[PDB]
Structure formats: C-alpha cells, structure tokens
Design an enzyme around this catalytic site. Structure first.
Site, short mmCIF file in Angstrom:
data_model
loop_
_atom_site.label_atom_id
_atom_site.label_comp_id
_atom_site.label_asym_id
_atom_site.label_seq_id
_atom_site.Cartn_x
_atom_site.Cartn_y
_atom_site.Cartn_z
N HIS A 173 0.76 -1.21 -0.18
CA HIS A 173 0.04 0.07 -0.03
C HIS A 173 0.88 1.26 -0.14
O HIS A 173 0.43 2.17 -0.70
CB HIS A 173 -0.97 0.05 1.26
CG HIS A 173 -2.18 -0.98 0.97
ND1 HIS A 173 -3.36 -0.70 1.47
CD2 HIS A 173 -2.34 -1.97 0.24
CE1 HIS A 173 -4.29 -1.64 0.86
NE2 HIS A 173 -3.59 -2.63 0.52
N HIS A 228 -0.69 -12.55 -2.67
CA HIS A 228 -1.91 -13.37 -2.25
C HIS A 228 -1.28 -14.90 -2.05
O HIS A 228 -2.11 -15.74 -1.62
CB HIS A 228 -3.10 -13.22 -2.81
CG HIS A 228 -3.72 -11.63 -2.76
ND1 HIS A 228 -4.69 -11.19 -3.57
CD2 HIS A 228 -3.17 -10.63 -2.08
CE1 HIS A 228 -5.06 -9.85 -3.03
NE2 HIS A 228 -4.09 -9.63 -2.23
C1 HEM Z 1 -6.12 -6.43 -7.80
C2 HEM Z 1 -5.19 -5.98 -6.88
C3 HEM Z 1 -5.33 -6.32 -5.54
C4 HEM Z 1 -6.64 -6.35 -4.45
C5 HEM Z 1 -8.07 -6.03 -5.11
C6 HEM Z 1 -6.25 -6.89 -3.27
C7 HEM Z 1 -6.98 -6.86 -2.19
C8 HEM Z 1 -6.74 -7.04 -0.92
C9 HEM Z 1 -7.85 -7.33 0.27
C10 HEM Z 1 -9.20 -6.72 0.06
C11 HEM Z 1 -6.93 -7.64 1.17
C12 HEM Z 1 -7.41 -7.93 2.74
C13 HEM Z 1 -7.27 -6.55 3.74
C14 HEM Z 1 -7.82 -7.41 4.96
O1 HEM Z 1 -9.21 -7.39 5.34
O2 HEM Z 1 -7.03 -7.34 6.00
C15 HEM Z 1 -5.55 -7.84 0.71
C16 HEM Z 1 -4.74 -8.41 1.61
C17 HEM Z 1 -3.39 -8.65 1.17
N1 HEM Z 1 -3.09 -8.21 -0.08
FE1 HEM Z 1 -3.75 -7.93 -1.89
N2 HEM Z 1 -5.03 -6.79 -3.33
C18 HEM Z 1 -4.33 -6.68 -4.56
C19 HEM Z 1 -2.82 -6.65 -4.91
C20 HEM Z 1 -1.88 -7.19 -3.91
C21 HEM Z 1 -0.45 -6.80 -4.26
C22 HEM Z 1 0.12 -6.34 -5.67
C23 HEM Z 1 0.09 -7.42 -3.25
C24 HEM Z 1 1.61 -7.61 -2.82
C25 HEM Z 1 2.41 -7.85 -3.79
C26 HEM Z 1 -0.81 -7.79 -2.20
C27 HEM Z 1 -0.62 -8.17 -0.80
C28 HEM Z 1 -1.63 -8.54 0.00
C29 HEM Z 1 -1.23 -9.40 1.39
C30 HEM Z 1 0.17 -9.80 1.55
C31 HEM Z 1 -2.25 -9.35 1.92
C32 HEM Z 1 -2.48 -9.99 3.24
C33 HEM Z 1 -2.62 -9.01 4.41
C34 HEM Z 1 -2.51 -9.80 5.85
O3 HEM Z 1 -2.10 -10.91 5.83
O4 HEM Z 1 -2.86 -9.28 6.89
N3 HEM Z 1 -2.05 -7.42 -2.71
N4 HEM Z 1 -5.47 -7.57 -0.48
#
Ligand code: HEM
Ligand code: HEM
Ligand code: NA
Ligand code: NA
Lengths: 713, 713
Positions: free
Chosen positions: A77, A244
């Site tokens: 972010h 993810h």
């Molecule tokens: C279309 C692009 C993306 C969408 C819509 C998306 C959406 C989200 C959402 C909704 C969450 C959950 C937040 C929560 O409730 O705690 C999340 C978690 C996460 N996203 Fe994505 N994301 C995207 C791309 C990315 C990218 C590019 C990365 C890193 C390279 C990333 C890494 C993560 C990680 C690591 C989590 C887990 C957080 C945790 O374990 O607390 N995301 N994402």
C-alpha cells in the site's frame, strides 16, 4: 473560523509551492539523510525485523503467529498510491503515516503495522527513515517466509507534512461511480491523473467493479489501474498472485462494528483508529476489509499453492460474515489452516479480483505459464516487487546501501557511466563562445535547454536534461519541443561537439547533454549582455548521453508537457484553468512562487514561447534579459479585455487612445490579478530591481538545469 | 479536489506556524528592511505624495480635485482592523493588499487608492514598504489639507501572504446578529477576540446597530469596538470627528449596480474590484458604502466645521439614493459644495454614528469641549492619529526615520534608557552561582523566567521580559504566574541584586529584568547538569526595569494568559479545545511546530506546570533536562483513557497490568495523536536524540528569552 478558501473557493492556491520549508522540518539545516543511512548497520536492522515477525503483541495479535502477511500489505500500500501521470504518490516520501493516506479505508489497520515498527525506528533513529523502513520491512517479511528478493535500496528521506495531491473530487469515502463527482465518464474512462476506481482505494474493488462480482469486468479495472501505476500484464499477475501467496483478509463480523479512522478518532487512541466493537476487536475477530479469504495451505511460507488452488478448483459466489462478495471452492476439503485455532481448517477461498487472473483470457495465459513454471513466477514477482517499491525513487545514483541490484533495468531511464575527464572552466568558456559564434540565437539556445531540463518532476524524480533524451524518440517529436527548430539546433550543437571532441587529448570529451545545457547558459549570458549586464551563469558538467535502446518510449509518454505556462503552451482545451496548470508545473519543478514568477518573466522576454507567440512578450527588446515583463504588466496606463474570438486571450490597449499594445493569456495576466503573485511581480517591476531580477533569474535557471543532478548530491 | 480540511474539518491546523517561510518571501534571506528604509529619501517621497493628491486619474477621478479624504480613509482602514485581545490586525504588516481584507465590503474602492500609489512604490522600490507607504500617505493627505501631524515612524516590514486571523465564523458578508454563527450573545456581548460588529466591517455599522438608526445605541457599539482597539472616549471622539472633517461618502445609486469584490473579479480587472454599472461608474456617480454624506463646507481643508454643524442643526432621518439611513439638517441652506459640479450645493448631512457623538451623554461632553476649544480637539486628534497608526509597532526601539516624535507615550509600554555599564561574562557567572546557592529550585527559576518572557506576542510586539513588569501590577497578581510562589522568588532575586549592585564600582549595575532572565538560564544549566550534561545557555544583558507609572494596568490585561499549554494551564473552560489554544500561543510566540514541541517537552520535565500539576510530567527525574516526555509519551506499553470526572484529563495505565503510570491533558496527548506532531515527537523520543533534544531546547529557550530585544536587533 471562516477562511479565504471559504469566501473564494475557486481562487488559485499557492501554498502547495511553499510546503516542506525549514520551519516544519525537525532536522537541522545541515542534516543529510544519505550520510546517516550509509552508516546504518543494515544487517542489524534486518535481524531485528526478522525477530519482530514472530513476536505477537496482544493489542493486535499476529495471524498464524506471523506478521509477514500484514507487513507485505503495508509495503505494497505504501508503494501502491503511485500514478505514472504525474509521478505523485508512491513509497518514496513515507506519506502513509500522514493524512489522508493514514486514514484511507484501504489502509485500515496498517496503523497497527506501523506502530509495531516504532521500537525499531526508535532504536535506529535518524539513520533509517520511516519511508525506507516501510519497504525494508516488506522485504524482510518476504525473506523470512522463504522468498528471495531482487534487492533493496535505501535513500528515501522522510517528509514532515502531507503532500498536496489530487486524489479525486468525491466527498464521500468509497463513493460508487456515477455520482455528482464521478471519476468516470464515457465507456468507463477514468479521469487523469487518478489511478484508482474509488476514493480511498489503492487500485480496484476486491468485490468487483462498483461492487459487482464479475471477474471478467474486474479484470478491465485491474489492467487499467495497474497500467496507470506503470505495470504491464505480466508484472500485474506476478504481483497479485505473489502477494496473495501470503497471509489472509479480515472480515469476521459486520463492518458497522468498526469505528473512526485515525484522523477522526479520539485523542486517547493516540494515532490509531478503526477500533472494533466485534467480540475481542482483533486477532481471530479482526475486521479490516470485510472479506474473509485465506489463499494458501501455508500462509506463512512461499509456495506455488495460489495457482494450484486457482486452477485446481471451481468457484462459487458466497458472502463473508460482513456481507461482502467472495468465492469458495466447490466440493473442496478443509485444507487451509485457521489463523488462531489449530483444531480448525477451512476450504480454499478467493476474491473476485483473484479469479480475474484465470477468467480474463490474456491473464489466463500468463497465470498458466506461472502455474506450470513456478520458477518463472518467482523471478517475475521478485523483479516486479523491486520495481513497485522503487519506481518513484529516481535515478540509480540515489540508491544507497549494500543490497542495491547491479542489473540496470529499462524502467530506471538509465544514464551510462562517465569514463573520461570532464571539461574545465576554460573549456566551458571556449564552448560557450563557439556556440554564440555559430549563429544560434538567444531564443534558440534558451528554448532548447528549457525543453531538455523542464521534463523533470520532483514527484518521482524522473526527467531532466541528463541523458540527452531530447534528441531521441519520443522527446524529439513532442509538439511543445517544436520538432523542426529542435532538429536544426541539435545538428549545429552536434557539429560543435564533434569538432571540440576531435581536438582533445587524453580522453577529455563533452557529452551532448552537457553541451545542450551549456549552450542554454551561453544564451542567458548573451541576453544579459544585450541588456547591458555582464554575468556568468554557473554550469556543472558530468551529464551523459543515453541511447535509444536504453529508452522506453511508452514510459516516456507521461513526461510530455501538454501544459507548460513557462512556454505559454497548452496542447488542447482543458477543464482546469491554465493558471492552475502553471502552479502544478511549478510544484513538479520544485519551484517557489517567487522562483516561478522570476522564471516566467524572464523566459517571456528571452523568446521561449512555443511558436514564437507574442502572448506575454511585453518588451520592445526581445532577447535581452530585462524586467520588462513586470514593468509593462503592471502599467495602469494599459487596460485589458478578453477577445471576441477567444475568452482566454486578452488585449492590452492604451487606456487614453485605444491603441493595441500587447496581447496575453491567462498565464500571463494572472501575475497582475492574483493578490499574492502581483505582490511578487511588483518587487521585480520596481525601478531598483534590474540587478535583483537578473541575479534571481540566473539562480532559478541554474536550479532547473540541475534538477536531476543526483550525481552531484 | 477534496482536501484534508474537507475530510477532517475539526483537525488542528499547524500551517499557521509555518507561514512566512523563506520560500514565499521574494527578498533574499539577508534582506534587512530597516537598513533600506534608513537610506530612503523620505523628503522626496513626501513631495511625490503631495503632487499625487491633486493628480486626478480618469479611471477613478478625485472628489473636489483632491484624493486626501480617500487616502485618510485608506490609512485609517489599514490601522483599523487591530484588536487588543490578540494584537492581530493593524497597519504594521500591510495586510490590506491581501485577502481577505483587500476584499472586505468596508474596504470597497480602497483598491483604487492603493493602485494610485503604485507609481511611487515602483519608483522607490524596497526602500519603502507598502505597510509604511499606506500610513505615510495618510499623513501627507492630512498635511496637504492643512493639519499638522504629531509625527511618523517607518519600519513596518512588508509581508508576502495572508496572516492567519480569526475574523469570525459567519459565512455571509455583513451578516446581522443572531444567526447561526452569531458573534453576539447575551446583552449584546461581542465574542473575544473580535473587535467589529459584523463580518467585513472595520468597527461598527454606519446606519446603526444591525441597521437600526439609533445614535444612542450606535454609541454603545462604537465605545465597545474602539475600546477593543485600545482607544478610550476622548481618543474615539477625536478620531471620528477628525476623520469626518474631510471628504465624503459615496452612494449615488443602488448597491445592486456594484459587481464582484477584487478576490472574485475576472482576471482582466487586474487586481481591482467593485466595478459599477451605475452611470459612469465613478467620480460623481461613485458607490462605495451606499451612503451619500458630505460633512463640512470645506471637505479638502482642515476646519472646525464638523462640530459647528453637529451642534448647530437638528437632524432628520432620511435615505441616500441607494436606500441607506442617514441624516439631514432641518431647514438648512445648501452650503456644502458638490464634489464635481460647481453649480450644485447641498444641505449638511451626518451618519447615525456621527450623531452618536452628540446624543451619547459621555461623548456629548467631550464633543462640546472640542467645539468650544478647537485647539484641544486638534491636539487630541493629532495624538490619536499617531496612536492609531503606530499602536501595533511595538517598542520605540523599532521606530525609524527623521519624524519620530520624542515624547514617550504610556501606550508604548516604555522601557527606560540604560545609562550604565552592563554586566560582563564574569559577572554573569558570578550571579548564576549566587542564584543557585540561594536555594531557589530548577522549577522555580524556569517557571519565573518563562512567566516573564512568554507574555510577548509577535502580532503587535507587546510583552516580554524587558521592563521586569512581572514584578508590577497586574502581572504579579495573575493566576498563571502563581502570585505567592512568584513573590518569594522575586524577593530572593532582589536581595541578590541589591548585594551585587552595592558591591560594584563605576556605575555598573544589573537590572531585575536581566537578573530574572539570567536566573532562568542558570536553572536550565543546573537541570542539564542534573541529567549528566555540560551545557551553557546563552544570555544577553541590557534589559531595564520599568516603573508602575510607565505600566498601564488596563492595557496590560489583554496580555494575561488565560491559556498557556506550555505551563499546562487553562483558567477556565472554553469553546475552543485546548490544543487549538496551544497552537495559537505558539503562533504569538513566533514558534514553529518543531520549536513548540521541543519547548513543551522540556518545560514539562523541568517543573514549569502551574501548581506543580503532574499532568504531562512523564519522567521519574523531574528537574533534569532529558527527552523523557517523548520516550514515555510514545511507549505503546501504556494505554490511555479519559477519566470519569473529567473528559479532558486522561489516565495512562500499563497495558498488561492496569496500573496507573501517568496523567495528562489534551495539550500533553495531542503530541501522541496528531499525525504531524507525533512525527515530531518521534524524532525527539528516539535513542539517538538526547543531545539533539538538549541543544534544540536551549536554542528555543534563548529565542523566547530574547523575543522583545529590539535594542539588539
Ligand atoms: C487487484 C489488486 C489487489 C486487490 C484487489 C487486493 C485486495 C486485498 C484485500 C481486500 C486484502 C484484505 C485486507 C484485510 O481485510 O486485511 C488484501 C490483503 C493482502 N494483499 Fe492484496 N490486493 C491486490 C494486490 C496486492 C498486491 C500487488 C500485493 C503484494 C504484492 C498484495 C498483498 C496482499 C497481502 C500480503 C495481503 C494480506 C494481509 C494480511 O495477511 O494481513 N495485494 N488484498
Ligand atoms: C464610528 C467610526 C466610523 C464609521 C462608522 C465610519 C464610516 C465611514 C463611512 C461609511 C465612510 C464612507 C465610505 C464611502 O462611501 O466612500 C467613511 C468615510 C471616511 N471616514 Fe469614516 N468612519 C468611522 C471612523 C473614521 C475614523 C476614525 C477616521 C479617521 C481618523 C475616518 C475617516 C474617514 C474619511 C476621511 C472618510 C472619507 C472618504 C473619502 O473622502 O473618500 N473615519 N467613514
Ligand atoms: Na511520487
Ligand atoms: Na497586529
């Protein structure tokens, strides 16, 4: 308290040009971040970060005993606000810790992530910036979980107040498209310079476009927003599947349990927000996004299990406990572990925007290749993660520390090494005389150097005169740059260069990039001489010439000036009035209001306007460096009215006789209208000001020439 | 574009602390206006101004062929925004040329006045500021028309952006009382710190209170507003009758003819406003206030005709051609000349607020005395005009040029000349040792010197430690100053002083004012020593002791701190939250946010709180100069909650055990909540920051100790 903004909500706002003063900065005037960072024990910081990953705090417990997933999100972010249109946003200034980004809905609970890092920030103090620490922590999370990163550079200096950015015009958080302030028009066209689909999101809506859980339509939003953050299809797939691979989302109960974001919360919350009344309010009970998806069977280890799940099941639309759309694997066993209870397991789940990677045909091909060849996946993701987290850091000369990757990447707009003696002061005097003896005019010299140097923007530190990319595609054919006049000037300068370089011994030579700037300097000297004033314009050699093959032409498009008030140029008709565009350009060039004023007034009388337009050329001695622009602009003997044909062009007539004296644009006349700018124009239009005008103009000219000179930093 | 102010409208605004940076200032960082002014040919400027009086411009013709009346209005409005409550407004920063005051309804057509002065400003350039020029022009208008002024000082430096002033909360120009943002409550009580009856007026409504033409009730408003601008009954009558000996008002047709104020006008108006569609729009057709009153039979010459008319007719309510209430002399001949037509004459007329000088019983007595003794009137008006135009300039040491009156006036808060050898470094070390040996504590020494120095405000440059007025009425009695503790410390310091002065040879002696500041410095040194640090605190002698008779007790009351976050003091409960009051006090003290932060954290651990409150005292080694306040404030092991008894007091408890560790106020905890302030606190609470905290503290302490030291400036 009613304010000037209340009374006059459409007046131009100059306070964006006077951010980041020495007043607001707690560090001394001599503080140098690079010198502090270069003494940091980076290895020790990383060991501290590695231990922190598995040291749960009870005020916000770690999923699966591991903060890695949280920190990856935090760092993706921090980087994810970046827009290629203006270079604004990104991780480069640590702006996630200020308003508004600290309180965006999509940054919910990242406040907790940043608070977890305070004891390390505290230990190492000024030697590591929050901006650097955010990204480093993401790297260490990846490493701790078995992923090999491509590298890391330090050197992001902390900032001390919010950046002034246009994030959109909606007045409600997450407002769906088609409201009174819609960021969309036509067939889903997102207004420039925005790079997200709703106010307060990083890129797209994880349920689908404006909430509609269709993976195919979601894919269009993903591709559009990622392109607008400088990522192509391969990079986009790698990043989303890579991210993810780790951790989970959080939506254990309804969103109405969650309270005020940090900027609205009570003083007792001490900089934190989103306090939740659902059950324990954290850990097993956490609510962040409202979705409740866990992607892999080992959320705290690198794997190729995201694509195994994506392609190995069929998916059914379903709802989180908060009521959000998400997808669950039909007929699957409970193989996914629970974040807190070792007796509990779960079926595989996916976001709408995860299934995009399989259901969009172009994405599907890449996803399949990554599925069958996970080593390709790992390499793409490593390279994309580096680009994501460094894309706004500027030239490689700004990269600090022992983990900087040696490979030179095309998106870095790379400048070749200099491998020879530089020209000295006597040489520079010789080359200036040759340039002036060639017959090139003040106007040609000043215009060409302006065109080359004024592509710089401080937002991502791209552009500038280094590289001599003005001679290459696409810069050489931009309308602002007057392609045919530009070609003739460069031809003449190149012959001067060839003759000078051919006469040297001992390897000494001059680059074209340096010669373009030095020639511009000769043009300004000559104009001062035309006015009856002898001045030297400073010049620092060391620029090098980049090749066409080291120049990404598509990436360079976003640096085209479609509005440059300094050359009285507007490529087409815009919604935003031209003066607001002028202040925006001054912000990107890092100019104060006094710098912008001086600079524009001089350029006008030097003949810098595109097309030799007479607009704002308020002098009868063009190509002499005088303060004529200001004296004539402020003369009450002249009366101004908009023309019949064009409401944005104005005629200045003698008030007594009616005789036409001048014409000008909104950019010209704003200096005689806006109360703050007119006060500045008055200083330079006074009878005592010629020496001050010349000195201040040379200073701001030299500043612009050196904007990209991080080799001298 | 949606902004942080839109999303979080009640957030604290720190940008008022970082106004007036070197970024927005067109002059070099070495520019000294005093030195420029002292070389101005003042006599030449005055000759030019005398010429200008009768050089009518066609674009805004001169009434009676003489701009004098217009310029006197201009100068009286420049000075007339002053409020004694905070010292804000007045003529001393030239703010009438910026928003909002350039566009207040009461300042209509003064844009024309200021534009008439541009050629003179241009000719003399940086050697005379706009701020000085507006007042000098008023003086020259008076002199041109046969009135001898009391004198004139230069030295008002120009400013380059709007001052941050609370002018009130109404969202409509000139809104009458009792609306949703009313500045009045109870029995017509005007909220502090305001000094006008309606938004966009200088003092009162010339038709009468909220438009009701009752001269007796208008008198109540006049008395109250002028008192709030530091003027008593005699000075108020002198000023109003003196002003209205000259010129005329303008209301030749309906106000609906008059267009946009300067900040709303089109770019082609080039900084002017109130363009009128009535007939020729100017001269004989001018509309400014809407009233049409000419007071005397010789509007361009000093006369005694104002009081002759006021007392020599009875008055009849009537209306101007714009429909505004005003008064006409019953049965009078047409004796008043017309501004443009020598064939036309007019009956005597008066404003409601003019009749106030006859129908308010207290004013009538003064008015009669002035009528019968014109020479008393002249002297009173000359003195009051000087006070009006210089009341915000500060100590006499700031007064420049060859027309400065020699007479010392009570409202200048006069400090005696120093007529003896000052103490040297050896003396200061001797006196510091004696102070420390007396028994006085760090807390007592720091508190007392803070109390003395922190009355300064940059708004009108009143207050500070020079004068030792802390020993006099009323300062010695103020609750914030802890009268009984203060008495014991001053008694001890006076006995040290007596003994040192009695031992000296030559005439060498130390003032109490110097000694109080020196003793404060010794307290800071001793505190640094308690912390294991060797520190010297700079000290500059040369303060002198003022007498009770040189200290006006009623004028001194506006300097009483009713809020001082730096001593965790709030005298009662206010509408505005305490942290807003902290930032307001830091602005008066001329502090940046980093200076405010450092200073407050140190004062807390040194024992500067009023009443020895423990609120914010986050250290176990009180009276030692450490960065404890920050390290403890930022410790996540502590959780904070508002108390049951008091929602503005907070308890900080161990998060694991629940044990109480600390208590704090909003002023304390805002540093752990506001995202920008917390970023500052983090720098000072880091592990590498102890010596930075000490050095930054000593610098800001010394700054505050020297704020009134214009004798050294
Ligand atoms: C279309 C692009 C993306 C969408 C819509 C998306 C959406 C989200 C959402 C909704 C969450 C959950 C937040 C929560 O409730 O705690 C999340 C978690 C996460 N996203 Fe994505 N994301 C995207 C791309 C990315 C990218 C590019 C990365 C890193 C390279 C990333 C890494 C993560 C990680 C690591 C989590 C887990 C957080 C945790 O374990 O607390 N995301 N994402
Ligand atoms: C109760 C206090 C006062 C009120 C209500 C008041 C009101 C006004 C108004 C309404 C005008 C007419 C503006 C126009 O239509 O052009 C005016 C004019 C003027 N006032 Fe006052 N005024 C006050 C105090 C002062 C003071 C203290 C001075 C100077 C010592 C002053 C000097 C003038 C002069 C010289 C003009 C004439 C302007 C011209 O000839 O163009 N007034 N005043
Ligand atoms: Na950026
Ligand atoms: Na003031």
């Amino acid at each position: 308290g009613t304010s000037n903004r209340d009374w006059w909500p459409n007046q131009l706002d100059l306070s964006i040009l006077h951010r980041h003063s020495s007043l607001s900065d707690p560090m001394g005037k001599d503080f140098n971040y690079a010198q502090a960072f270069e003494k940091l024990d980076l290895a020790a910081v990383k060991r501290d970060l590695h231990a922190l990953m598995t040291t749960s705090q009870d005020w916000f417990p770690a999923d699966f005993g591991h903060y890695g997933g949280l920190f990856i999100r935090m760092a993706w972010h921090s980087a994810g606000t970046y827009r290629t249109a203006d270079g604004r946003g990104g991780a480069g200034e640590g702006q996630q810790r200020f308003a508004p980004l600290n309180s965006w809905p999509d940054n919910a609970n990242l406040d907790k992530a940043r608070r977890l890092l305070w004891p390390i920030k505290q230990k190492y103090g000024r030697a590591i910036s929050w901006a650097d620490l955010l990204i480093l922590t993401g790297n260490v999370a990846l490493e701790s979980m078995g992923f090999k990163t491509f590298g890391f550079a330090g050197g992001r200096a902390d900032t001390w107040e919010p950046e002034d950015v246009y994030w959109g015009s909606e007045k409600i958080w997450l407002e769906l498209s088609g409201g009174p302030n819609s960021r969309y028009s036509g067939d889903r066209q997102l207004e420039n310079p925005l790079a997200a689909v709703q106010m307060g999101l990083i890129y797209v809506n994880p349920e689908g476009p404006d909430g509609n859980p269709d993976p195919v339509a979601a894919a269009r939003d993903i591709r559009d927003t990622f392109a607008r953050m400088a990522m192509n299809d391969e990079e986009t797939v790698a990043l989303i599947a890579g991210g993810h691979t780790f951790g989970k989302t959080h939506g254990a109960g309804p969103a109405s349990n969650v309270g005020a974001e940090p900027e609205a919360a009570g003083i007792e919350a001490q900089g934190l927000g989103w306090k939740s009344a659902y059950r324990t309010g954290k850990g097993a009970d956490a609510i962040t996004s409202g979705l409740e998806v866990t992607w892999t069977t080992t959320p705290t280890q690198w794997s190729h299990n995201f694509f195994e799940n994506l392609f190995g099941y069929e998916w059914e639309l379903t709802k989180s406990p908060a009521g959000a759309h998400q997808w669950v694997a039909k007929g699957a066993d409970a193989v996914i572990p629970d974040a807190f209870d070792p007796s509990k397991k779960h079926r595989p789940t996916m976001l709408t925007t995860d299934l995009s990677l399989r259901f969009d045909p172009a994405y599907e091909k890449i996803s399949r290749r990554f599925h069958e060849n996970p080593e390709q996946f790992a390499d793409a993701f490593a390279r994309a993660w580096f680009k994501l987290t460094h894309r706004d850091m500027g030239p490689r000369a700004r990269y600090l520390g022992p983990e900087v990757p040696a490979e030179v990447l095309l998106w870095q707009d790379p400048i070749p090494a200099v491998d020879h003696p530089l020209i000295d002061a006597a040489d520079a005097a010789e080359l200036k005389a040759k340039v002036l003896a060639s017959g090139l005019t003040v106007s040609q010299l000043v215009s060409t150097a302006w065109a080359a140097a004024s592509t710089f923007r401080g937002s991502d530190k791209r552009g500038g005169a280094n590289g001599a990319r003005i001679r290459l595609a696409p810069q050489k054919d931009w309308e602002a740059n007057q392609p045919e006049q530009l070609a003739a000037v460069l031809e003449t300068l190149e012959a001067i260069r060839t003759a000078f370089n051919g006469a040297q011994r001992g390897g000494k030579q001059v680059s074209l990039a340096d010669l373009i700037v030095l020639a511009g300097c000769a043009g300004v000297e000559q104009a001062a001489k035309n006015a009856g004033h002898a001045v030297t314009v400073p010049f620092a050699p060391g620029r090098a010439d980049a090749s066409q093959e080291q120049t990404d032409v598509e990436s360079m498009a976003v640096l085209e000036p479609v509005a440059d008030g300094f050359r009285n140029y507007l490529k087409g008709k815009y919604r935003v009035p031209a003066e607001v565009l002028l202040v925006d350009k001054a912000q990107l060039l890092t100019l104060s209001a006094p710098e912008m004023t001086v600079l524009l007034g001089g350029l006008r009388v030097l003949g810098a306007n595109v097309g030799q337009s007479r607009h704002g050329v308020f002098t009868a001695r063009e190509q002499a460096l005088t303060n004529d622009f200001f004296v004539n602009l402020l003369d009450m003997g002249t009366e101004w009215k908009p023309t019949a044909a064009d409401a944005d062009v104005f005629e200045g007539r003698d008030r007594a006789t009616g005789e036409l004296k001048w014409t000008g644009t909104r950019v010209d006349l704003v200096f005689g209208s806006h109360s703050q700018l007119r006060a500045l124009a008055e200083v330079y239009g006074s009878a005592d000001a010629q020496e001050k005008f010349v000195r201040d103009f040379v200073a701001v000219w030299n500043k612009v020439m050196n904007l990209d000179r991080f080799d001298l930093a």
